[PDB]
């Protein structure tokens with residue numbers, strides 16, 4: 001049918017009624033074919049680096065060229081600050097990819113495929129037009145199905161820029177049909193010997209009643225550096241304080257201590273993350289410069305091998321039949337192909353439970369950061385980067401919503417675990433079957 005008839009269709013009405021009895025698992029919703037996306041959530045990890053030049057820029061900034069590299073502030077006080085500005089620009093650049101990609105390729109936000117345990121998604125940005133960049137690799141793996149958790153790493157060996165992180169969400173519907181989404185997890189970016197800890201923001205999906213969903217960010221995101229510098233990004237927009245669609249305000253401070261006083265901000269960046277934003281230094285409101293304009297530089301999609309060469313666990317290969325059925329809009333075929341894959345997985349899980357076997361994660365392992373960790377679990381090293389950055393930010397190390405600070409209600413939750421997925425580069429180095 002035409003999108004104009006989605007909202008009043010029997011299919012959408014039945015979907016909205018299934019929401020009324022939402023059991024907590026989005027996979028139990030009767031989402032009609034027209035609102036389904038043929039893309040699995042394991043693919044979303046690629047949204048962290050669709051602007052290769054911005055991802056790598058911090059590695060090119062040094063003591064001898066930092067002022068010359070900093071266009072937004074040729075008077076930047078230090079290379080560390082120049083790099084924080086670059087990392088902030090990169091983070092902002094990821095937002096359009098993360099939260100707007102489906103609206104552009106599918107017509108609206110849609111329900112993504114719920115990955116199966118063990119699903120993989122790999123590719124690379126060859127950066128052919130820039131030999132100084134080198135190849136940047138993406139490894140994404142579904143480390144959990146119940147609940148869904150995607151772990152990932154994006155790395156550029158040539159310039160020593162590596163990123164790793166994981167993501168999980170907890171979603172619920174309000175009485176007005178707003179889908180509230182709390183993200184869990186975090187991402188760490190290492191630029192040579194300098195590190196940055198990034199926390200994703202909470203968000204909500206609106207437009208469900210009218211059958212034209214879209215993401216609206218809220219809350220805050222943090223970027224804590226090993227240099228002490230901290231960037232606090234606040235999201236607002238329509239229906240909220242600002243009233244401006246996809247708006248944000250980011251402030252950079254000398255340290256988390258100073259972030260308690262907005263007047264201490266070294267820079268203030270404001271605008272729309274899906275559009276243009278300006279930057280003001282200190283408090284010189286008078287003078288401002290363009291910080292980032294999302295419309296000027298198109299996202300660069302990574303290179304993925306042809307389907308004919310993909311391994312059975314690779315996302316697109318595994319979901320091929322379902323993706324095809326979704327593109328056709330065939331109600332019965334979608335149910336048939338999806339059930340086929342998910343039932344095979346059920347059988348696998350039942351065999352594992354009864355046979356005393358556990359699925360072994362491929363390139364990531366779950367580290368227990370608890371004071372009293374599971375006896376067989378891997379534990380963090382003394383010089384663990386997350387521990388040091390979380391300490392600097394006064395961030396909770398528990399499995400609380402992303403960005404939860406020590407002392408917050410979510411951190412004082414009784415018997416909350418502290419398990420975090422970590423990339424194990426050695427496992428990729430000794431990978432003997434998967435290739436790029």
Ligand SMILES: CC(C)CCC[C@@H](C)[C@H]1CC[C@H]2[C@@H]3CC=C4C[C@@H](O)CC[C@]4(C)[C@H]3CC[C@]12C
Nearest residue numbers: 026035044098099109110111112167169181213
């Ligand atoms: C779309 C309606 C009808 C059904 C529900 C769709 C929900 C499950 C979808 C739509 C928007 C999706 C989010 C879009 C973007 C991101 C950022 C990525 O880094 C992690 C996954 C995450 C957080 C997705 C989680 C799943 C999500 C919230």
Ligand SMILES: [Pb+2]
Nearest residue numbers: 206216238239
């Ligand atoms: Pb709104």
Ligand SMILES: [Pb+2]
Nearest residue numbers: 365366377378
């Ligand atoms: Pb384990």
